[PDB]
Write a structure and sequence with these properties.
Belongs to the glycosyltransferase 29 family. The protein is mainly alpha-helical. 60% of the residues lie in helices and 0% in strands.
Length: 35
């Protein structure tokens, strides 16, 4: 009983976080790095 957890986490959990992280990286953070 783990199959549901895979796709349940495959929602805004990673889908949105991975996205907004790319947003963050391209906003405040130099290139991809801290600086």
């Amino acid at each position: 009983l783990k199959n549901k957890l895979k796709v349940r986490t495959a929602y805004p959990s990673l889908r949105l976080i991975h996205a907004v992280r790319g947003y963050w990286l391209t906003n405040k953070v130099p290139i991809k790095r801290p600086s």
